[PDB]
Design a protein around this ligand. Structure first.
Ligand SMILES: CC(=O)N[C@@H]1[C@@H](O[C@@H]2O[C@H](CO)[C@H](O)[C@H](O)[C@H]2O)[C@@H](O)[C@@H](CO)O[C@@H]1O
Ligand SMILES: CC(=O)N[C@@H]1[C@@H](O[C@@H]2O[C@H](CO)[C@H](O)[C@H](O)[C@H]2O)[C@@H](O)[C@@H](CO)O[C@@H]1O
Ligand SMILES: CC(=O)N[C@@H]1[C@@H](O[C@@H]2O[C@H](CO)[C@H](O)[C@H](O)[C@H]2O)[C@@H](O)[C@@H](CO)O[C@@H]1O
Ligand SMILES: CC(=O)N[C@@H]1[C@@H](O[C@@H]2O[C@H](CO)[C@H](O)[C@H](O)[C@H]2O)[C@@H](O)[C@@H](CO)O[C@@H]1O
Lengths: 146, 146
């Protein structure tokens, strides 16, 4: 089931992991360019959605506020999660927000092109990334409105 | 996770529900045109897949062998599950086969356009149709190669 409370198109938000409490950031310099972060609020943690239409209905591009790049999540090449210019030129720029089966207030950030979800954990490296496999709680996110 | 054993493009199969053992048929006259059936093998139960590319990567159109029409699954008008000519002209002609998280040998027939899955049951009317909601066993299918 698609997450029923997706931010209106163009509205700004942070993406905060339910369990770790870390947020996603997206910047243009100093790798990792897209990763999780535990610390103060900065602009590179702010995103907006472009709503998919036609074949991309129910998918969304996740655009960085300060730099305008959109997120990607892929299994083809490192870095697996990153950013790129444009408004969703590539199929791996398109995400589905899938509500959790048990917790109605959290969702997985799912990528149809790569069949992956994003995760945030405090255990093994890489502590942030994408994953094709079983459902774990570390894959659960909130939209944090600003 | 996408079902790991999806039939190769053009390969013929029946879609059989894991639990009911019923199959999907797709005919050109007499509503319901697409429904479930318990009985001998007949040609309007035979399908092939058209593989999606680009924005339809990991999606598939389900095409009738005898009549060439593809399935659709929608929530906007009746019938909700039906068929239409072409090779997947419309967005709701495109399906994802999502492996069950508990039973790796079955999958859901998921529609991205309508956020629904197909089900087959012996309980309440309508006994076949589409559904947006919790994961249930009557939503689980097999590819039955012929
Ligand atoms: C101080 C420092 O090196 N922190 C690292 C992070 O870098 C910070 O990330 C935030 C994200 O909003 C912002 O871009 C800051 O300018 C930047 O210094 C980051 O690189 C992480 C990666 O795991 O490590 C430290 O936390
Ligand atoms: C054509 C090419 O090699 N471009 C590289 C980029 O690769 C594209 O990245 C997008 C991201 O949405 C998508 O994965 C495409 O399939 C892929 O070809 C990219 O990797 C950048 C830096 O990440 O380098 C090249 O520009
Ligand atoms: C088996 C294994 O280590 N696989 C790696 C992934 O780890 C899994 O990640 C999920 C994320 O939801 C969860 O934390 C599991 O417990 C863990 O096994 C992951 O690190 C990816 C990153 O690319 O690599 C392997 O697939
Ligand atoms: C109340 C009702 O009609 N719910 C339907 C669902 O029924 C569930 O079925 C599963 C087995 O699949 C199990 O027996 C549950 O106890 C039962 O509630 C189910 O048929 C779905 C369709 O997948 O929708 C119905 O509404």
């Amino acid at each position: 089931v698609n997450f029923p409370n997706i931010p209106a198109e163009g509205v700004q938000f942070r993406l905060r992991a339910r369990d770790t409490g870390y947020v996603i950031y997206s910047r243009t310099e100093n790798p990792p360019l897209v990763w999780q972060y535990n610390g103060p609020p900065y602009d590179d943690q702010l995103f907006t959605l472009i709503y998919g239409t036609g074949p991309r209905k129910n998918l969304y591009a996740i655009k960085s506020v300060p730099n305008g790049r959109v997120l990607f999540s892929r299994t083809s090449a490192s870095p697996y999660v990153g950013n790129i210019a444009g408004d969703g030129t590539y199929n791996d720029n398109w995400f589905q927000f899938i509500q959790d089966d048990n917790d109605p207030n959290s969702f997985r950030i799912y990528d149809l092109a790569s069949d992956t979800v994003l995760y945030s954990r405090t255990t093994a490296d890489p502590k942030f990334g994408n994953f094709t496999g079983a459902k774990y709680d570390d894959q659960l996110w909130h939209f944090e409105l600003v």
